[PDB]
Design a protein around this ligand. Structure first.
Ligand SMILES: O=C(O)/C=C/c1ccc(NC(=O)C2(NC(=O)c3ccc4c(C5CCCCC5)c5n(c4c3)CC(=O)Nc3ccccc3-5)CCCC2)cc1
Ligand SMILES: O=C(O)CNC(=O)c1ccc(OCc2ccc(Cl)cc2)c(NC(=O)c2ccccc2)c1
Length: 551
């Protein structure tokens, strides 16, 4: 069947930001008929995945628990209430949610309406290789249905992927745990070879059968009967397909592929990618495979069979993936150094700590993070990508010297250090105070993140070249700026002084010996690095348990 069908009504609006003007270019790429052919390897991997899914017990969330997961700025319902009414448990919001729930239990077939919109994302236009990227498309159901998805499946999508895929499930790892996983897998091989597999338009390649197979895995959970019915109904009425409405309420067409804005998008994509890849590893006869899967992002680390054999085994892997309806965007390439593998737009790099010991960390090309940060300092945005980049890339030369320095000078000037800001981590929205960054960083990356040095020449050159290309002042200017920012933070005491001392320890002549922050252990990071929720409409406010009067 066609991934999409269009009436011709426009997908209307809600260095460069992607807009609805380029929607038709995206529409052409994502629209095609899928041909899928399954074999014994696919069926064998599925049964192995289902036997692991069988150990899961999932709970039904109450209306109140599902309401508390709704982001404050989540799109309002077309039925007379918004995200604020949902979070306050208003009678109208609650009544509508309960009637949506009852309808899921009673109607097993009527397709559920979804809205289609062009995503507005900021990218950097490099006129050296190609042109501007067209806008990605987001498909999501009404707020009432989104609350019902949480009741039925929040616990499933938060627990099942790790039970099924084990150590291969990428969203269970903090950045440092991800690096540790890749380094350990790489070290385990006699002669390692690794590759990234990029599927072309993954969401469009997801067939009706893929979506039913994904439900067959969910149905292996111990579930309340109403959760079992809601999952069955949601599969047939929403997850397999349905009609598309634009922002103006006009009929845009229909979808028979993965919706990008549903609670099961990340979990479904991860299970589907893992299934197809593990089966393709068997068809290609790759030896001692270790996989790392995050949605449609796949990394494979295996035992090398020789340079020519590896190229042939990769073409065999690609042929199997293509039969399973996961054709490649860029053809995969074997790599023989772990640092050369780009996965989830990141690569492993190495630095030294204050005692000269090697420390592995995750980094990336800083062009898109700096360009998005420039857009965010220019205009008020709903999500602060600079904040998520500081958190996730805290050990990097660029996040430390440029992002920390720039945003802490802005927060000092606006006197907004204590103001909680929204940022996205693995698709979920987190409300975080910048004053909590040293404790967050210590927990996610270790105390060494504040003392890294001896960065590689390749990493230093990539950062310096990026600054020149974007017209950003050189690294020496950032050191001078950080010294002043640090001095002002220290004078304020409490958490603000800790930002100065820890975040900007790199900027001082004679480096201070840093001891662990005692209040760091109090931060409740239990919802962090458990699962992926991209497009799942998930929110959490950062909480602190068992505080001490003097901390
Ligand atoms: O050789 C030497 O000894 C010294 C050289 C030297 C060169 C340039 C400066 N620039 C500045 O002082 C100003 N801009 C900046 O001090 C500046 C700060 C951050 C900048 C950023 C981002 C960096 C990441 C956080 C968000 C801000 C961008 N651009 C920046 C410029 C350059 C710019 O204007 N825009 C973009 C566009 C895309 C990407 C990045 C940028 C402020 C007043 C005059 C212009 C200072 C010193
Ligand atoms: O499931 C889906 O369908 C869509 N996929 C995702 O949602 C998705 C998959 C893997 C990801 O990253 C993994 C990673 C990267 C760097 C580091 Cl240091 C560690 C791990 C991210 N990235 C972030 O969330 C992010 C936010 C802010 C800053 C940096 C990364 C998103």
């Amino acid at each position: 069947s066609m991934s999409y069908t269009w009436t011709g009504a426009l997908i209307t609006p809600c260095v460069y930001a992607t807009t609805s003007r380029s929607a038709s270019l995206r529409q052409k790429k994502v629209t095609f008929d899928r041909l899928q052919v399954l074999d014994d390897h696919y069926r064998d991997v599925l049964k192995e995945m289902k036997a692991k899914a069988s150990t899961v017990k999932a709970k039904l969330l109450s209306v109140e628990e599902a309401c508390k997961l709704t982001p404050p700025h989540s799109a309002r319902s077309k039925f007379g209430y918004g995200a604020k009414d949902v979070r306050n448990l208003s009678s109208k919001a609650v009544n509508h949610i309960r009637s949506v729930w009852k309808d899921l239990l009673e109607d097993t077939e009527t397709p559920i309406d979804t809205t289609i919109m062009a995503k507005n994302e900021v990218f950097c236009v490099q006129p050296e290789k190609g042109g501007r990227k067209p806008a990605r498309l987001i498909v999501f159901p009404d707020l009432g249905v989104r609350v019902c998805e949480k009741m039925a499946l929040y616990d499933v999508v938060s627990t099942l992927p790790q039970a099924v895929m084990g150590s291969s499930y990428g969203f269970q790892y903090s950045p440092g745990q991800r690096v540790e996983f890749l380094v350990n897998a790489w070290k385990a091989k006699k002669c390692p070879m690794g590759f990234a597999y990029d599927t072309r338009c993954f969401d469009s390649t997801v067939t009706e059968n893929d979506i039913r197979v994904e439900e067959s895995i969910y149905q292996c959970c111990d579930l309340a009967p109403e959760a079992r019915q809601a999952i069955r109904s949601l599969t047939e009425r929403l997850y397999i397909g349905g009609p598309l409405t634009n922002s103006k309420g006009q009929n845009c067409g229909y979808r028979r592929c993965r919706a990008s804005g549903v609670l099961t998008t990340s979990c479904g994509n991860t299970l589907t990618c893992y299934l197809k890849a593990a089966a393709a590893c068997r068809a290609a006869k790759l030896q001692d495979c270790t996989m790392l899967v995050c949605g449609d992002d796949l990394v494979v680390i295996c035992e090398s069979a020789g340079t020519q054999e590896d190229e042939a085994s990769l073409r065999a892997f690609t042929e199997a993936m293509t039969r399973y309806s996961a054709p490649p965007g860029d053809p995969p390439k074997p790599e023989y150094d772990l640092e050369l593998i780009t996965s989830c737009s990141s690569n492993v790099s190495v630095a030294h700590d204050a005692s000269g010991k090697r420390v592995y960390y995750l980094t990336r090309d800083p062009t898109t993070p700096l360009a998005r940060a420039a857009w965010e300092t220019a205009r008020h945005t709903p999500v602060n990508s600079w904040l998520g980049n500081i958190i996730m890339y805290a050990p990097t030369l660029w996040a430390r010297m440029i992002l920390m320095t720039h945003f802490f000078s802005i927060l000092l000037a606006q006197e907004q250090l204590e103001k909680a800001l929204d940022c996205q981590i693995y698709g979920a929205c987190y409300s975080i105070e910048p004053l909590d960054l040293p404790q967050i960083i210590q927990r996610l990356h270790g105390l060494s993140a504040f003392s890294l040095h001896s960065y590689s020449p390749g990493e230093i050159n990539r950062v310096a070249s990026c600054l020149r290309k974007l017209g950003v002042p050189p690294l020496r200017v950032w050191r001078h700026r950080a010294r002043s920012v640090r001095a002002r933070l220290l004078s304020q005491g409490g958490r603000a002084a800790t930002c100065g001392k820890y975040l900007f320890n790199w900027a001082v002549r004679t480096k201070l010996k840093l001891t662990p922050i005692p209040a760091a252990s109090q931060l409740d990071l239990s919802s962090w690095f458990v699962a992926g929720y991209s497009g799942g409409d998930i929110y959490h406010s950062l909480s602190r348990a068992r505080p001490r009067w003097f901390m």
